[PDB]
Structure 1
């Protein structure tokens, strides 16, 4: 069946670098004969993740962006294309996972956790549908580990292959050099992640006080300044409902 594994980083942002080096290695070892699907938590992050992969890999493989605000016409034509292609990377949200049958995928990658436990199962079921071998890799940070524990408890799913990861400065520079986003765009993306993760904190039994600062600090990581907090307005923080809440001060800076 599906050969499952997990790559555990110290920081959420490191999962980005982990995915990049893994992909780099697969492109090398397979001589660009590589067809893969990578799942992500939000639309904005999918677009971002897609921007990076285009910058890194456009010379080697096609990169296709698939999510829930895309028109049905465009969905079908992109499905048609990825069905036909011998290689390429489909970057998507939980928009897929169900029903779609994509032949000869070598690997399924996941950055971070799904919106529900069962969606882990649907995600991985996109490969190994018509006799082929296949692997799956879950890229998470230390503070997401209770999810893996929850897989054993609720679904009896034990992922045997587990390893730790720390990125080199070389890969960090390579990835950061490919980030073309302005600060306002990085802010939008990271805020989307915060909301997404915030919404599954209780369900997966995460510690909010550890995970949320860790997600927010990605803002500083991608802008190469790890003591930088996310600039926001008071009205906005109020909208989020964190205007009187601790933790938000550790994540955000009120430049209103």
Structure 2
């Protein structure tokens, strides 16, 4: 299919809510809802996408725009307009399906639809239901039946669950599907799900297999995503609407990025603690920050340390995929409203989540994928606000920083070294209540996460894996102590003949 590039333009005419109303693109009812939100104007991605999405041209749309620049309303506004344009046709049926890679993001998008409803009660007739895992299936279906929604927001697993059973009842008249965080949804482990979803919707569509228009949105995408999305794009033309220059870095330029380089992975823990201590003092506890970590077990560990250090000064919130969904949703609601606090999380929170007025993003170690560096730091400096980010890594993780330069043109100007005092080490370690077995579990989770990104980040296996493993000895305050394991466990890892394995583990069988 024919890809049509519409690159970034400097001196193009400003599109406004009024201009779109006057032009007949937007109806008064959606104009009213968005005007009442009192935004200074429409963001660049909103100006670029609203009219093309609503065009009668037989095309799909790909849109790229930086983190926090209003991509959500860029698709929600034209979706609502479509519902108004076709309001007397198939009025009890789902016309738009929006898919997101995390449950909390799907639920946030639903909350944004409700904000549109609250600014104009006349839009409540275009109802919305979320279909996400970790919620009661029957309760959600009762809501589908009661509200007969025109908009569904979903995560892939639960959507497939519902579609296998109820595609005929609600989904035979879909006109749009949206992949939010599109590049994430087309990686391995989501791509097959999106192809399943797309196939069902196309097969069940009452008009034709190519009726559905597909919209892809992300801060991180290019021409390669069209290839990955080939099996789910129906139309003969695809419009690529880009608000970022070809060679311009995808990271938001307003973020003051820095990197703090330690000799050892574990030292990044002490560096982050001292950094947070300094920010709390200098800002007089007026501090809202998000700190990312590589694994669930390490995130939980890091939370314990930060509570011991800082619970007297700020709330510390624990956010990852093993937190119950009820608690995930409640903590997201709280951290959205709170003026201060520290959110400690995995990449479950890297993309999409909009927590207003976060001052700083912190990272201990590397993200789960290169693109998530851009999204992680993009949790700050949203909707025209300022922000800073600090990457805490060890020397053996430096090839990640080089890959950011080579692959994404991201060059972090501020770089500094860190070495922990014996005082901070004692302070942090003495409060740790985890047993050795728990510490082993935590460090092993890190070994596995780092092993999976060696190729992508061009790490030296022989250096990074022993360094990560040595965290066990650092945390137990004995640097020659290796991780005690069995022979069969070493065999499962495939390291029973490796010198790398001998450096990491002691066969205490």
Specify the TM-score bucket, using the shorter chain as the normaliser. over 0.9
Deviation string 1:118-156 (CA, Å, 9 cap, x unpaired) is: 010111111111222110000000111111111111100
Distance 2:292 2:286 in 1: 20
Deviation at 1:5, TM superposition (A): 0.4
Deviation at 1:75, TM superposition (A): 1.2
Instruction: Please give the secondary structure, in 2, of the residue aligned with 1:181.
Output: coil
Instruction: Please give the secondary structure, in 2, of the residue aligned with 1:146.
Output: helix
Distance 1:221 1:128 in 2: 35
Distance 1:138 1:201 in 2: 18
Deviation at 1:159, TM superposition (A): 0.5
Deviation at 1:98, TM superposition (A): 1.4
Deviation string 1:176-199 (CA, Å, 9 cap, x unpaired) is: 112111100000000000000011
Deviation at 1:244, TM superposition (A): 2.6
Structure 1 window deviating more from structure 2 (233-242 vs 3-12): it is 233-242
**Where does structure 1 lack aligned partners over 5 or more consecutive residues?**
none
Higher-Rg member (1/2)? 2
Distance 2:419 2:442 in 1: 23
Distance 1:36 1:177 in 2: 25
Distance 1:74 1:89 in 2: 16
Deviation string 1:5-25 (CA, Å, 9 cap, x unpaired) is: 000001111111000000010
Deviation string 1:203-236 (CA, Å, 9 cap, x unpaired) is: 1111111111111111000000000000111111
What is the Cα-based RMSD across aligned positions, in Å? Answer: 0.9
Deviation at 1:68, TM superposition (A): 1.3
More contact order relative to length (CA 8 Å, sep ≥ 6): 1
- Show the counterpart of 1:102: 355
Structure 1 window deviating more from structure 2 (70-79 vs 47-56): it is 70-79
Distance 2:363 2:411 in 1: 16
Structure 1 window deviating more from structure 2 (136-145 vs 175-184): it is 175-184
Distance 1:37 1:160 in 2: 21
Distance 2:456 2:353 in 1: 27
**TM-score w.r.t. structure 1 length?**
0.98
Distance 1:216 1:123 in 2: 25
Instruction: Please give the secondary structure, in 2, of the residue aligned with 1:95.
Output: helix
Distance 2:317 2:311 in 1: 11
Instruction: Please give the secondary structure, in 2, of the residue aligned with 1:126.
Output: coil
Deviation at 1:246, TM superposition (A): 2.2
Deviation string 1:73-97 (CA, Å, 9 cap, x unpaired) is: 2211110111121111000001011
Structure 1 window deviating more from structure 2 (91-100 vs 36-45): it is 91-100
Matched, 1:192 2:445: yes
**Where does structure 2 lack aligned partners over 5 or more consecutive residues?**
1-254
Deviation at 1:115, TM superposition (A): 1.3
Distance 1:96 1:28 in 2: 26
- Show the counterpart of 2:332: 79
Distance 2:424 2:322 in 1: 32
Deviation at 1:70, TM superposition (A): 2.3
Structure 1 window deviating more from structure 2 (65-74 vs 36-45): it is 65-74
Show the 5 A alignment for 1:1-256: 2-256=255-509
Distance 1:53 1:153 in 2: 34
Distance 1:192 1:99 in 2: 25
Distance 1:228 1:75 in 2: 37
